[PDB]
Amino acid sequence: XXXXXXFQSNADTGCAIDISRQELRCGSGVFIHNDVEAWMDRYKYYPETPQGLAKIIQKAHKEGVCGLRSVSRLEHQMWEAVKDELNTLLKENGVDLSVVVEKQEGMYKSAPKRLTATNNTFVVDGPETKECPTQNRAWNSLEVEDFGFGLTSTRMFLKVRESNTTECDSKIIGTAVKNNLAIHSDLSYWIESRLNDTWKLERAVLGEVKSCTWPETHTLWGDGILESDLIIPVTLAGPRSNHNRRPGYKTQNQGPWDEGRVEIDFDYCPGTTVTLSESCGHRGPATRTTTESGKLITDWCCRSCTLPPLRYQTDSGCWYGMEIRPQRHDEKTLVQSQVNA
Amino acid sequence: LYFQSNADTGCAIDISRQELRCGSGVFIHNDVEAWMDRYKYYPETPQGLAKIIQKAHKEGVCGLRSVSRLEHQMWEAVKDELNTLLKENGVDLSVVVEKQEGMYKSAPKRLTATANNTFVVDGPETKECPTQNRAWNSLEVEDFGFGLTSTRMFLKVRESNTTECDSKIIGTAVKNNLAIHSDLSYWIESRLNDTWKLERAVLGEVKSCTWPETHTLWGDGILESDLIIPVTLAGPRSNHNRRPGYKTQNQGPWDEGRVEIDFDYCPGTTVTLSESCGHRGPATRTTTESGKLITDWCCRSCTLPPLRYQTDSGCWYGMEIRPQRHDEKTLVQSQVNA
Ligand SMILES: *[C@@H]1O[C@H](CO)[C@@H](O[C@@H]2O[C@H](CO)[C@@H](O[C@@H]3O[C@H](CO[C@H]4O[C@H](CO)[C@@H](O)[C@H](O)[C@@H]4O)[C@@H](O)[C@H](O[C@H]4O[C@H](CO)[C@@H](O)[C@H](O)[C@@H]4O)[C@@H]3O)[C@H](O)[C@H]2NC(C)=O)[C@H](O)[C@H]1NC(C)=O
Ligand SMILES: *[C@@H]1O[C@H](CO)[C@@H](O[C@@H]2O[C@H](CO)[C@@H](O)[C@H](O)[C@H]2NC(C)=O)[C@H](O)[C@H]1NC(C)=O
Ligand SMILES: *[C@@H]1O[C@H](CO)[C@@H](O[C@@H]2O[C@H](CO)[C@@H](O)[C@H](O)[C@H]2NC(C)=O)[C@H](O)[C@H]1NC(C)=O
Numbered sequence: 072x073x074x075x076x077x078f079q080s081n082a083d084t085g086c087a088i089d090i091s092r093q094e095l096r097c098g099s100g101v102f103i104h105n106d107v108e109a110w111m112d113r114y115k116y117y118p119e120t121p122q123g124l125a126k127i128i129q130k131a132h133k134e135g136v137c138g139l140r141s142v143s144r145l146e147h148q149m150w151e152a153v154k155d156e157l158n159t160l161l162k163e164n165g166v167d168l169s170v171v172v173e174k175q176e177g178m179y180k181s182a183p184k185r186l187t188a189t190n191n192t193f194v195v196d197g198p199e200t201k202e203c204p205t206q207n208r209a210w211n212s213l214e215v216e217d218f219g220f221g222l223t224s225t226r227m228f229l230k231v232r233e234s235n236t237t238e239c240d241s242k243i244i245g246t247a248v249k250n251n252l253a254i255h256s257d258l259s260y261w262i263e264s265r266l267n268d269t270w271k272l273e274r275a276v277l278g279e280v281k282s283c284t285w286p287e288t289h290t291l292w293g294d295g296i297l298e299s300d301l302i303i304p305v306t307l308a309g310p311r312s313n314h315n316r317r318p319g320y321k322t323q324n325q326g327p328w329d330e331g332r333v334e335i336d337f338d339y340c341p342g343t344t345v346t347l348s349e350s351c352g353h354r355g356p357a358t359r360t361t362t363e364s365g366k367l368i369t370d371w372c373c374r375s376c377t378l379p380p381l382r383y384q385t386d387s388g389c390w391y392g393m394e395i396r397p398q399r400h401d402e403k404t405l406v407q408s409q410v411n412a
Numbered sequence: 413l414y415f416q417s418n419a420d421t422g423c424a425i426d427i428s429r430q431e432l433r434c435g436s437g438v439f440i441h442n443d444v445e446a447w448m449d450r451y452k453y454y455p456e457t458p459q460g461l462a463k464i465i466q467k468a469h470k471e472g473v474c475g476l477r478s479v480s481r482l483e484h485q486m487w488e489a490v491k492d493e494l495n496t497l498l499k500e501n502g503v504d505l506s507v508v509v510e511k512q513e514g515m516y517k518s519a520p521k522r523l524t525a526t527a528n529n530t531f532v533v534d535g536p537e538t539k540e541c542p543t544q545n546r547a548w549n550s551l552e553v554e555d556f557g558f559g560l561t562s563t564r565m566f567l568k569v570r571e572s573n574t575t576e577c578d579s580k581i582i583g584t585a586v587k588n589n590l591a592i593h594s595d596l597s598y599w600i601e602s603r604l605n606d607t608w609k610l611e612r613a614v615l616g617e618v619k620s621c622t623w624p625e626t627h628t629l630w631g632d633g634i635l636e637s638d639l640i641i642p643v644t645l646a647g648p649r650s651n652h653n654r655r656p657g658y659k660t661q662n663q664g665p666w667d668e669g670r671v672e673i674d675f676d677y678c679p680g681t682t683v684t685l686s687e688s689c690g691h692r693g694p695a696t697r698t699t700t701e702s703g704k705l706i707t708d709w710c711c712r713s714c715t716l717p718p719l720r721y722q723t724d725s726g727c728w729y730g731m732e733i734r735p736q737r738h739d740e741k742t743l744v745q746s747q748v749n750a
């Protein structure tokens with residue numbers, strides 16, 4: 072599964088039903104789909120030329136770049152799928168260099184080196200090592216040049232970026248608002264806000280947690296921003312937008328951002344309560360509702376949040392927002408986020 | 413679960429992404445192109461509204477000015493019903509709806525939910541009912557109404573005072589090379605071609621409410637002098653509402669009704685960069701009042717293709733673009749100051 076290559080036509084054209092207006096309507100415009108919560112991946116990354124990429128790497132290798140960290144899971148999946156190919160490319164040209172791709176657990180961190188146009192390894196992702204520290208790795212060096220048709224999925228071809236930026240690739244971003252529901256999204260983030268008495272964040276699904284910055288061009292309601300109010304941190308591709316807020320909550324810099332997939336919404340973790348209490352503990356690291364031993368922590372408080380509570384759902388269970396604390400300071404087997412972003 | 417209650421569902425072809433995708437999300441359509449006839453306003457309570465009106469008149473509100481063409485059509489269509497309801501309550505008061513020509517100006521008064529014998533809706537600027545004593549932007553859409561012919565939307569009186577355009581009917585979105593700010597009468601399009609910039613805008617009428625920041629893209633660090641469509645004319649405070657070489661078209665042909673903006677030459681005309689060209693002025697039509705064509709145009713420091721308006725009486729150029737020949741032959745120029 073990695074085949075190599077080697078009616079306004081700028082717009083979407085089709086039909087949809089608008090459930091709110093209760094109208095079936097055809098024509099042209101902009102259609103944003105939910106691709107984060109989709110069964111398969113409709114999209115796969117590809118290099119414009121594997122040979123080109125191999126050249127990019129060996130060059131960066133000469134200039135002392137020991138490896139790379141992917142921007143996203145999709146990018147990782149490319150490096151994973153194209154490594155054997157890149158390696159036979161180097162091998163057959165007499166280049167003493169092999170690409171090595173390690174499993175990625177947790178958030179995709181940024182790095183400061185950049186691949187440019189044109190030991191003996193190039194290490195993609197993995198744990199932090201003294202041998203190949205992040206500071207000598209490349210990150211966010213590629214972007215989408217063109218899209219390629221496929222039967223099963225659609226191809227995205229990567230070129231080398233012309234400049235140095237921390238911005239997420241805008242080619243794959245879809246932001247939209249209609250019927251007072253607002254969506255900031257790309258291939259791995261789906262962030263939904265809605266008007267109900269007030270405008271506020273309602274739900275978010277993060278396929279992984281990345282470290283690029285959400286571009287202003289693709290951001291709604293981005294005036295008069297106070298970053299410390301932004302639920303999802305801008306250092307974690309949180310859109311710098313007033314939609315990325317919830318009354319009674321500040322930036323979740325210590326949310327469980329290193330668990331892999333994270334779903335944010337506002338409801339109670341199963342079998343728990345949350346109470347307003349001026350005697351509750353101050354905000355701290357996001358905390359799970361099950362201990363290491365597995366037992367359920369039922370009673371929770373908050374000093375000044377609003378209900379329903381900010382809830383995180385991950386592979387290992389349910390967590391609460393930073394402002395929500397265990398009512399009883401007696402449980403010692405806590406599982407808490409050790410992130411600071 | 414709520415995502416069903418407010419979303420769109422269907423299929424579309426995305427040429428840019430070379431794919432056919434189905435699913436759920438937000439589909440923003442092109443409505444200023446023929447779809448204004450498939451949407452009607454109706455007051456949610458003609459009875460209540462009548463009471464609201466007789467109260468406002470009783471408090472020194474001589475009349476009203478519609479936010480938009482669609483609102484005006486509702487007034488035109490409900491006045492007979494309103495009047496006959498005012499009769500039944502024994503109220504010396506009748507609604508008068510005059511033709512609306514030009515831009516839909518704003519007014520400072522508001523209706524509330526709780527001399528002459530008339531309530532004048534729209535029209536020219538009388539002194540028997542000045543704009544300063546009229547209400548404006550007191551209505552918003554409560555819910556939508558199913559129809560085969562048209563989608564109905566029912567209006568409530570606003571609980572609050574604001575210059576903001578009703579947000580319920582706004583659709584704003586960006587994907588691939590394309591950014592749209594739109595509602596039922598405005599379609600404002602910008603595109604990424606080397607740079608993000610305004611490419612085209614169609615305005616069914618020119619209104620004077622303000623485009624809400626909640627539905628504005630790229631709204632950070634705004635220099636209002638660079639916004640092409642003025643914020644006083646529902647221009648979005650967006651860096652998408654910009655074109656290099658051009659500043660705010662405060663003196664556009666905004667009083668002509670329908671206006672379309674794009675970047676292209678007026679038929680039979682040329683535009684050349686000249687250091688000796690005149691400075692920004694009111695926008696000028698390519699035909700003179702008699703009906704003669706002006707062919708030669710200059711600009712000092714605009715970029716090309718030229719900023720172009722099209723209205724019901726012809727083609728016009730942006731404020732920076734000036735007739736190269738000084739033998740001024742009674743031009744037709746915008747008199748609007750926005
Ligand atoms: C969209 O936004 C609206 C608000 O604009 C939300 O509506 C609110 O929903 C919440 C719960 O979902 C409601 O809160 C509940 O109120 C019940 C009755 O209200 C009492 O308190 C008010 C205080 O102002 C008094 O005025 C009133 O007379 C009543 O005495 C309570 O019975 C509920 O209590 C539960 O929670 C508390 C929390 O501590 C527990 O201690 C209780 O034991 C009990 O379990 C609760 O407080 C609120 O009333 C709604 N407001 C309005 C205006 O309707 C919608 O929920 C939101 N939509 C979505 C989808 O989220
Ligand atoms: C690209 O820009 C980034 C940030 O704008 C640069 O990252 C900084 O690099 C220096 C030295 O490498 C560090 O001390 C900083 O902490 C980095 N800031 C970050 C990572 O936010 C990066 O060096 C630039 N890369 C190139 C090739 O110019
Ligand atoms: C009360 O309001 C009515 C409706 O606006 C006024 O009637 C108009 O008066 C002007 C005066 O020049 C005429 O040109 C219009 O033709 C009248 N409208 C008609 C006949 O439908 C009336 O003058 C006002 N009375 C006042 C201010 O005392």
Ligand SMILES: *[C@@H]1O[C@H](CO)[C@@H](O[C@@H]2O[C@H](CO)[C@@H](O)[C@H](O)[C@H]2NC(C)=O)[C@H](O)[C@H]1NC(C)=O
Pocket residue numbers: 605606
């Ligand atoms: C997108 O912008 C490019 C400029 O980068 C436009 O290309 C120019 O097109 C005009 C007329 O077609 C030519 O006179 C120029 O010489 C072109 N420039 C270059 C560098 O080729 C292009 O027309 C724009 N396309 C759209 C659809 O707006």
Ligand SMILES: *[C@@H]1O[C@H](CO)[C@@H](O)[C@H](O)[C@H]1NC(C)=O
Pocket residue numbers: 520521522573574
């Ligand atoms: C509406 O609000 C504006 C902004 O404060 C104010 O200037 C205006 O007088 C208000 N009008 C009414 C009728 O309250």
